[PDB]
Symmetry: C3
Subunit: 490 residues, 3 copies
């Protein structure tokens, strides 16, 4: 009696969460949020990127014009999606440096094709095959022109096509490798010889090679596919005596943000910025462990499957006389993070301190604002999965990606530890600041009891306590009473 | 009266600057410095690196010996500068893997060439062309030897050149692809056949291919360029029946720090360690946003166009009775960063505290010393801009560089935030330390007024105040007076 | 007299060590530990990885079956070690893209070979050479079959081998380039023609090229080596009229963690997880400066040759009346890190504080636990040293590795500075916490003397001092005595 107690404290919750800081591998805090995205819907959203589902067609099949890919003519995409079920159903072919032609067409993002009138005087055009049926008739790749002899003559071709446009032209062409010498004569009326396709700045010479390969869709022959880009002011020149699978025109070649992805995920009617082979994923979080292959505004790939960011202070159980924050949280404090408990003539009371609570909350919201909803866009990259063994180039592609992921995984680990340490520090600091400013108000009218509470040595009723909480307490009013109570022989 | 006031404080400035810390996206400090270099002079300084301006010549034109490049013979460089205006003016040629030959010669850093006496018995040497004029006469690449028939015979060449030196030899040679069968016979007196250039450890076979290409400087033929490196103790062997553009000797191949850069920046008479395509840039700062392409001791390329490093404390306006540092800076404090203000019998005074001021300044200068003027040198790297579409290899080169820049940009962002937080912390700490040590000196002779000031409960004249500032105040001298004043019923 | 002194302090050592923090380039602490591994034993331990020492054989020589490599047949490895002394001693050969075949076999980790019965009707099998002696007889590569004419006929080969297995088959084969037209006829009875090796998904055509190369072990001819991987359900088809160096079967191709390393280090009977070309190195430390080439659970390569992690507090000399921690350490404090010194009626004493000491030690041990003995495994990577000049691909391989090392070296530098700052902070904090809690116990019975000591204003014998140290001091017992002593006119 003749005194009061005023304790400073902070909240605690019954269901806290464990995070990592620089000081502690495990510390329980009142709340945290997940920074690694680990699930996908399992579908690729068809918005807001332009998606082209290849269905049974690879990009290269759609480029050459396999009959089952006729519906793709002239289409564009942000992301071309190639399915594992895709298969070729025309004349058997290969592309030396297939991966590069696939990449450059994918990045260009368009199959726009402009027909041109090549002068094929002296040969038969439009060769077809039972291996490439279009609406039940023998046919061929839509964008290619199989030239054969005319009246058992195949005169030497020396054919030109100038580029008088303001843009580049991509030409796709081929060399036919017949199964037998019989086929060579039947088709071209003479022995095979080289093909040379040239411009002012480039030349490619290819040798047709007669011979049986293992039959594919019953065909032992092959076509090998080549490409040439022709600049404005340059000229395509084609020089051949046979075996030429000629271009019917050129593809536009564009630059932009298009790419290609291998995925079996279904395409859905929905909207998501970040695409992975597993499906679209939300991009609120800064990191993700779903797939290293991404397109769009995506979280960065890391190895961790969880990284928890503290969003509240240390969670400290309440010890079973009122008491302050020293080794003690207040589970009953539910309208603030920090506050006051008092005992005086009028009872025992609690009040939240708004300023300290808001100071902590604002700083935590600040770091969430830097980390949440801030992903950056990436588009065409490098391949990261491989179906064939290749050696040196693939070794480098894999090492580049491994290197990158380990460096990001490190950054993520350090960032979360540093941020969590800072959160513990800033929330501890708001408690300490509140205690110190209360101490300063009280001057010589109170003593520190060592448990986060002051013994106030004068009668201090509810309004008096309120004056301390509100920062309007006038210590001079009570000093005489308090000094007498403090410094009395007992 | 019978008392004095002593306030602890810190300076403030009218023109502060905004920086970023871990706690605050924006906090005003008294001063900061820029860590991202964003401008260039626009010229490449000719010192201290040895610069070779290619003018109208590419490195490869200078290597082969295009007549307009004769002035480059045998020159060395640290940095070869290739101009966008550069053009070839000799026989039209291509180099399979041009980029690699360009790179290896660039990195070697020398065009030193040693003539050798090949045994070309039975052929005519020194073929020339109107397409390659030297001083108005028909000529040819200086370092190459166009062999043609002698008396309508071209006997099979089987020619040797041993390397009996202690160093490697770089041989440059070529294959002529004539426009027509008429030219083939006119030049070599027989049908074309393969060329084989070999050593004990390597072999290259190349097939001349007759045919018209689009005319370049009125020439429908082409030369294709190849290279062979011959080790000490090995032997070059050249085997041909025509179409051989022979070497006249070898290039020295060196190892060191040389490179090549594409730039149109003028070369100036000045001295700068760091070269970019935009010109030389100062290298005081740790980061730069001028160009990802660099040579020499250069700041690291980042995406940010500014990163401000705090070089002073938080800048806090002065509130409109003297008062201390609590929510309050002192704009009138101009000879120190921290200090004392007092009110006593003799007036109101101010003095700077040297120790605390110097402690902060020394620590800030320390971090400037780690960050300023400490760039590291890089020399030949990878190419980072491309004039042609290529696919896989280029995709990887671009991804490697993008990856690197994003990781450095992250490091830069975190470093500056961490350093700035530390600067705010260390400057706040010097203020708090000064307050605490003053508190300790005063013992029971003063009370904390809560605004960064002490109420000293005894007469404390100028010399008394000085004794506190100087750390020589003897509290026992005044304790009796002070205790009487403090603990008095009023 | 009628008073006592109680000082709070921390230990100091005569032999401290210099570390780097964020605040200080150099600060002496009581102890530190090295985080960069800089030495090796100089031997490669034969455990726990399966080591295969190539001795005089390269992997490719062991693959083809050079007689000196017969002992390697069918062996497996985790790490194949190639020696600089290794040399070929059979028919001279080259491998276009040698580096890739070396890499893919190295990564597969097995030389397991299954013989198959090819139908070589109409030719002579098992050609041998004096250039490839096996037990003093003319012989040839064990895994290859040199086919020559039979009765001066070499009928066109068109030979099949289906893959009816559940795994992939690696075929190694070759093309013989004879020195002269005489050898061509002597061996194959007709002019040279192309070789085509194909599957349903691939084709390779190679042209034998007759001509003398510089003699190697007295042989001017060459064999060029090729490879083909055949999938389950696919078929190998070989088509040739001569010059075929045929496969005798296939290699198993596996996937796993195998690699290859160039080293001259001796192999020892010992156990070490981390292998470098310099020898095995311990992997307790997180970083190493021994070699960028590593295999196994290894520290990460950095440029620094030392990084010292503080494992104790700031080391502060003792100043030459007892005194506390303010600018002063206690070299005589050897059974604790923090403690108490007192002066009372019964003498001058010292005692360690266990709690504070253990708190610091536990946190330091925690960070050691994150950093020590926690390396991660890497296996087959990219090559990092090169014996030949190559240009573009090598430039990229080198730049990737340089980039990686600089980023890790940065991470290491920042990590150690941050950790050391945290250690200084946490150890400083334990001292400050101990002082503050002692202050709180003492209430109004003591004053802070400003040197880390309290003047206790009552008789405080050994048991009284112990009660303070033990946290059981009851300030109310002594308050009357203390207040009288404190507030007395003198
Ligand atoms: C070189 O050898 C090849 C493999 O032995 C061979 O290919 C095979 O040819 C046979 C016979 O033409 C094909 O068998 C087909 O036989 C009947 C004929 O009416 C067809 O109706 C069937 O569809 C049946 O498949 C094989 O399919 C074929 N095998 C492979 C792997 O392609 C070549 O013919 C040989 N080349 C030469 C020039 O002789
Ligand atoms: C294959 O076709 C080529 C393109 O049509 C052709 O090249 C062209 O040849 C003509 C005629 O020689 C050149 O025209 C030149 O005509 C007069 C002749 O006196 C010259 O004075 C002029 O300079 C004029 O240019 C073209 O310049 C040339 N076109 C190109 C694109 O190179 C080849 O000649 C043909 N090849 C064969 C073997 O017939
Ligand atoms: C093309 O030129 C080559 C280099 O001059 C040449 O190779 C050289 O051939 C000679 C003679 O055969 C070899 O000399 C050998 O002479 C005696 C003959 O009994 C041997 O016992 C010795 O071992 C001695 O070496 C050279 O070794 C050889 N030089 C090289 C560098 O390989 C070719 O023969 C020529 N090719 C043609 C088709 O003529
Ligand atoms: C490229 O075109 C030229 C010109 O048409 C071809 O040259 C003719 O080839 C025929 C058939 O081999 C010869 O009989 C003529 O004598 C050639 N004409 C001229 C004007 O030289 C040439 O063969 C073609 N080249 C290729 C590789 O197909
Ligand atoms: C490499 O040089 C050898 C030796 O000079 C050439 O071989 C001669 O070639 C001529 C012309 O074709 C033949 O008539 C001779 O019979 C060959 N001589 C010998 C000793 O074999 C060979 O042709 C050259 N090779 C190449 C690819 O040019
Ligand atoms: C691949 O094998 C086929 C079939 O055996 C070869 O074709 C024969 O080649 C001979 C010799 O040149 C000719 O006389 C026959 O007329 C061909 N037979 C048939 C059925 O066409 C062919 O030459 C081989 N190809 C290669 C590149 O070696
Ligand atoms: C362009 C052309 O001639 N196409 C014809 C081919 C080829 O002559 C041979 O297949 C070449 O080997 O033969 C067919 O029987 C076929 O297989 O469909 C009919 C087709 O019209
Ligand atoms: C080495 C040689 O023979 N050079 C001569 C060439 C070539 O014979 C043809 O250009 C080959 O196509 O012809 C010229 O008229 C020329 O164009 O300058 C004269 C020159 O001396
Ligand atoms: C497969 C074969 O025929 N091997 C024979 C070779 C070759 O005929 C020529 O070396 C080819 O140039 O010649 C030998 O004298 C030799 O050099 O060892 C004997 C050997 O049995
Ligand atoms: C925990 O923190 C997150 C992020 O600020 C917030 O959205 C959520 O409401 C909080 N949860 C609780 C139970 O307070
Ligand atoms: C793709 O091919 C499969 C298998 O032939 C067929 O059943 C399916 O209808 C095809 N899909 C499309 C879209 O053409
Ligand atoms: C096609 O090329 C031939 C060359 O043999 C030429 O003579 C003819 O005029 C060209 N045809 C047309 C329609 O221009
Ligand atoms: C995504 O697909 C990859 C590759 O197939 C797989 O490893 C991973 O488990 C998948 N992740 C999720 C969340 O579906
Ligand atoms: C605000 O201050 C006044 C001072 O008279 C005090 O009585 C009142 O209770 C305070 N309000 C609160 C909500 O604490
Ligand atoms: C601000 O800081 C920089 C770096 O220390 C210093 O060079 C400059 O003089 C300072 N400017 C002012 C106005 O104090
Ligand atoms: C480069 O070529 C241009 C265009 O022909 C010419 O005007 C200029 O003088 C040349 N410069 C040099 C240095 O030869
Ligand atoms: C040049 O080579 C021929 C080979 O046909 C040789 O006979 C002659 O001696 C050589 N000439 C000289 C000058 O050594
Ligand atoms: C430097 O040149 C690059 C590439 O042309 C350009 O993007 C950039 O704006 C330039 N920077 C400056 C400061 O001139
Ligand atoms: C230094 O200390 C003495 C103590 O007598 C004091 O009087 C003097 O004013 C002090 N000097 C300064 C510059 O404060
Ligand atoms: C120093 O620290 C290391 C790592 O904790 C420890 O192993 C060693 O015993 C310590 N050395 C001394 C002299 O205390
Ligand atoms: C390797 O070759 C050298 C040199 O001929 C020989 O002395 C040594 O015994 C060989 N070693 C083995 C293991 O065969
Ligand atoms: C080998 O191939 C020939 C083709 O000429 C074939 O006729 C023969 O039956 C085959 N031999 C065996 C043993 O199967
Ligand atoms: C390891 O070997 C490398 C490469 O030869 C050498 O540079 C380095 O000094 C070696 N390090 C040690 C500790 O032996
Ligand atoms: C523990 O506390 C008791 C309190 O009576 C004290 O007397 C004793 O000396 C303390 N023990 C130590 C080791 O300080
Ligand atoms: C094929 O070419 C012929 C010329 O022989 C042309 O009339 C026809 O329209 C072409 N068919 C196409 C492009 O589908
Ligand atoms: C060209 O070669 C001839 C030999 O026919 C020689 O005499 C002359 O000096 C050479 N000219 C050069 C290298 O400029
Ligand atoms: C070589 O082939 C013959 C068939 O001519 C066979 O009998 C013999 O066993 C073979 N020798 C080997 C595989 O060592």
């Amino acid at each position: 009696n003749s005194t009061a107690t005023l304790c400073l404290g902070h909240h605690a919750v019954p269901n806290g969460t464990i995070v990592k800081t620089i000081t502690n591998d495990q510390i329980e805090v009142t709340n945290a949020t997940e920074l690694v995205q680990s699930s996908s819907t399992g579908g690729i959203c068809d918005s807001p990127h332009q998606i082209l589902d290849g269905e049974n067609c690879t990009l290269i099949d759609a480029l050459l014009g396999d009959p089952q890919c006729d519906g793709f003519q002239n289409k564009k995409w942000d992301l071309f999606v190639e399915r594992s079920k895709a298969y070729s159903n025309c004349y058997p072919y290969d592309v030396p440096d297939y991966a590069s032609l696939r990449s450059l067409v994918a990045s260009s993002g368009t199959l726009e094709f402009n027909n041109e009138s090549f002068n094929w005087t002296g040969v038969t055009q439009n060769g077809t095959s039972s291996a490439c049926k279009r609406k039940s008739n023998n046919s061929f790749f839509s964008r290619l022109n199989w030239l054969t002899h005319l009246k058992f003559k195949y005169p030497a071709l020396n054919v030109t096509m100038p580029n008088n446009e303001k843009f580049d032209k991509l030409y796709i062409w081929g060399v036919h490798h017949p199964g037998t010498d019989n086929d060579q004569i039947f088709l071209y009326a003479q022995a095979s010889g080289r093909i040379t396709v040239s411009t002012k700045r480039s030349q490619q010479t290819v040798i047709p090679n007669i011979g049986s390969r293992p039959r594919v869709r019953n065909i032992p022959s092959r076509i090998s596919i080549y490409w040439t880009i022709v600049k404005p002011g340059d000229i395509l020149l084609i020089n051949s005596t046979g075996n030429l699978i000629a271009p019917r025109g050129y593809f536009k070649i564009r630059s932009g943000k298009s790419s290609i992805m291998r995925s079996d995920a279904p395409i859905g009617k929905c909207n998501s910025e970040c695409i992975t082979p597993n499906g679209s994923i939300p991009n609120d979080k800064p990191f993700q462990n779903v797939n290293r292959i991404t397109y769009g505004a995506c979280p960065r790939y890391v190895k961790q499957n969880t990284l928890k960011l503290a969003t509240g202070m240390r969670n400290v159980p309440e010890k079973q006389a009122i008491a302050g924050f020293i080794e003690n949280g207040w589970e009953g404090m539910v309208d603030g993070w920090y506050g006051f408990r008092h005992q005086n003539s009028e009872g025992i009371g609690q009040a939240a301190d708004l300023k300290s609570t808001q100071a902590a909350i604002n700083q935590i919201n600040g770091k969430l604002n830097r980390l949440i909803g801030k992903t950056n866009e990436k588009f065409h990259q490098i391949e990261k999965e491989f179906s064939e063994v290749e050696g040196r180039i693939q070794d480098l592609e894999k090492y580049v990606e491994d290197t990158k992921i380990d460096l990001w995984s490190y950054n993520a680990e350090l960032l979360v530890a540093l941020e969590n340490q800072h959160t513990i520090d800033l929330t501890d600091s708001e408690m300490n600041k509140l205690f110190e400013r209360t101490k300063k108000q009280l001057r010589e009218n109170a003593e520190d009891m060592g448990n986060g509470c002051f013994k106030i040595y004068h009668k201090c009723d509810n309004a008096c306590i309120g004056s301390i909480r509100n920062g309007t307490y006038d210590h001079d009013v009570y000093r005489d009473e308090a000094l007498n109570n403090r410094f009395q022989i007992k």
